[PDB]
Amino acid sequence: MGVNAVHWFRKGLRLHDNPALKECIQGADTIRCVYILDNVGINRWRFLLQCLEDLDANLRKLNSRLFVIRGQPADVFPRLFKEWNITKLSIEYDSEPFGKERDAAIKKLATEAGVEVIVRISHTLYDLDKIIELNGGQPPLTYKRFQTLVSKMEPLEMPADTITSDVIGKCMTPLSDDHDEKYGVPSLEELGFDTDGLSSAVWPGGETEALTRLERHLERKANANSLLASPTGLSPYLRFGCLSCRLFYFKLTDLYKKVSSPPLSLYGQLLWREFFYTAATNNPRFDKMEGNPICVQIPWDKNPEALAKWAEGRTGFPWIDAIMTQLRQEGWIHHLARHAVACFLTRGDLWISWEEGMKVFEELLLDADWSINAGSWMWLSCSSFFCYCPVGFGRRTDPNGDYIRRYLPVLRGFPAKYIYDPWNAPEGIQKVAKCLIGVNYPKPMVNHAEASRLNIERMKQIYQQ
Amino acid sequence: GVNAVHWFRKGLRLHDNPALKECIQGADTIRCVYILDPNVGINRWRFLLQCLEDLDANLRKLNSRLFVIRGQPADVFPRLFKEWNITKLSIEYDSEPFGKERDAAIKKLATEAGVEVIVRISHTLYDLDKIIELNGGQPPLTYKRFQTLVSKMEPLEMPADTITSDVIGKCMTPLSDDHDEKYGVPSLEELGFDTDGLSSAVWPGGETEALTRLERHLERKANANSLLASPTGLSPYLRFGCLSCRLFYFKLTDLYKKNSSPPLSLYGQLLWREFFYTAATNNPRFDKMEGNPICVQIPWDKNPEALAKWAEGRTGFPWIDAIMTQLRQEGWIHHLARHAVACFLTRGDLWISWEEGMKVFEELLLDADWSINAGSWMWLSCSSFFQCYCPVGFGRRTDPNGDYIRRYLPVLRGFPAKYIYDPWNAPEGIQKVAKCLIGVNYPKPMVNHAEASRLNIERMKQIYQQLS
């Protein structure tokens, strides 16, 4: 009896600009926010778990708690509907095809149980289906066309009001005394992860951290060092929904006017994100080659041993290996570093499928969703949307090689003259550095000049086809 | 003639035994001895005695025997030197401070008697002193720096040749027909133990068992069940020396190669061993809080009754009690189960000193040496190395049906999975049909976890504010 509401957290792990949760509370006697735990690496799971602990803490401020439940949503929700006597369920819209299919299945389960479902857009700046409509029923496959469509859209509506005590009103959350025992956020070890020797996260999760960084980021806006994680970086918080894209949009617009009509390059980060979400939303095989209508079909090498050396940073190229080590250790690498390793794996040196690189980035990268990961890997491998040197790229960006020394400590003894090509160092240099190439650090896995010359010919064959 | 003794302590094996190999060279006679030197529980003693009978049986294949002697080494060895007219003594090096002090005293006594002492490294992958020298004179206290040091060392030389007929050559072992009466391996009852109702060992000791399980482990390598002892587990055989760390290292590399550059993660089990041995070797108070230069001073509770409930698996938390029951009964628990009970006792629930948990583990755990035990307990209690699990939720997450609980806490077998991890929440009618009244046939929880852990988190946060 009564109006009992559940808001389902997946993305949008925040209380600000949360229109679905705002609407779910309206007219509700009770409210319960739930997160349901279904390649994913340990840095992704730690960021998520920290996101849920920050949500729980913020909900405690409102005399509520987060409910964490393990299971598959299709089995879990029929039980919750009855146990809690639910009449309304709310979600932030998910544009990605697998999320679409999951949410369509839950909507059917909810309707059959008599539960009304509130769906609101708030993970993207725009209604992706409306952009596709203005473009004639197909997503744009060029960024400039996307810019044209966006510039004709209506102005962005204001972000939804933050969930506070005034919004909650008389709505309450029923809680047992053993809430943590049944619904608490688990630790990594409670999920069976090996955390031995794990250091403190370079990217701590949560809306609180995201809003702290947003304020520091904007105050700052008002190279070798670029390779390292910035304390005001926002990319993972946008992927998990800790930071609203619309709030970030409006704060940037507000800053720009304080210091007219801003160029759309002002929103370059947000717009590239929307582009890939829009391209992917109606393409269930967007993350594949075969069966993907927009993906060029290319005969990639099948080489699991070469793939493993790339994935684990054992290529013998310190520039490539340091990037993949920072990626694995911390979960974020510079955009141009993503270019560098993606080129090395696919069209550049190894000629391995972009699907394999995408799968590694899905496990390790914090800030790249399914759509953005698939679209970027297709783009950089010349597979859709119409060769870096693994020595010179790093040497030009960081001549002293401090980046290599930070993430490949075994190379720390090498001078800047050989830090990016240690195989060229004389034996005496290697001995004083206590690192014999081919013993303490591997030899380069390919001759870059020979491999790149071959692959360049292969793709020219593809594109003359 | 040249009469030699090889002193077994660790390294209870004939393969990759450089000290024994060097001792045999140029010797006319050889005698292998183990000295039973007066907390160690019955499962540790049984594993040891099975290692010694495997050693004795493998020495019989070479027309030799193991000589087992009860006494203190500083008293026994002056007698043996004269009785057997010994001029050669060999040992595998012991990095741990108490073993270091003992061996220095025996080396002095041997020199006084005119006996040369042969010492060879073979219990650890590396020369721990060479690691510390490379680091500038102090051990690394982060595992990342230790990995950096290890990746700069020379490649490991191959393990020593197995003691065979060929290696023994002309050397021989004088034997009497009364050998078992004088020097035999004793039984547990013969050491005064109560073995009534003891079931057959889940972890049988010895080099033969170790090498069998190594072969199966390599083949297999080529969840709720994780909690149970694996038939291919190697951890206790590495602690006792039935299996060489260096042999394991080389079989792992060979399996990997059949790339030439495996990540260090491949050898993860071995390097964490080496890390704690290195940290402990020059620290004679490594197992203490006061007077230990690397350990944060924390005002732990003194509560012997709560410690006893934890040690004996009477906490009232079935996940905790099942783990401690498996540990007592078999001598091995999963690594994550060790985290669970360590957090419950120290930083999590009871606020009892990590020194007390280490002493219980020292008595019951088969696979954790002094250095690894002390280092792990300091680590998990946030007391060193620059460092809260739910006692209901963790088990429920790991084994939802509760089969682990039903296996080790049979009084709870009747409870459904819904309450098997928190049986105090079960309605009385469930408790009645399960024939286990909570507070009568199985104790109530000894603490309110939510209240205890919240207060102890605040205690620890104050500790690190004082430090900062």
Ligand SMILES: Cc1ccc(-n2nc3c(c2NC(=O)c2ccc(C)c(C)c2)CSC3)c(C)c1
């Ligand atoms: C309370 C307690 C006592 C002992 C052991 N324990 N027992 C054995 C070993 C270890 N420790 C570890 O592996 C280890 C590795 C990394 C880190 C960061 C820690 C904290 C422990 C390796 S050999 C057999 C454990 C796991 C917990």
Ligand SMILES: Cc1ccc(-n2nc3c(c2NC(=O)c2ccc(C)c(C)c2)CSC3)c(C)c1
């Ligand atoms: C291999 C790889 C995977 C993923 C990402 N990656 N990660 C994140 C984002 C993106 N892609 C882009 O920005 C982007 C924009 C324009 C073009 C033409 C391309 C090719 C990528 C935006 S949000 C966080 C990148 C940079 C490379």
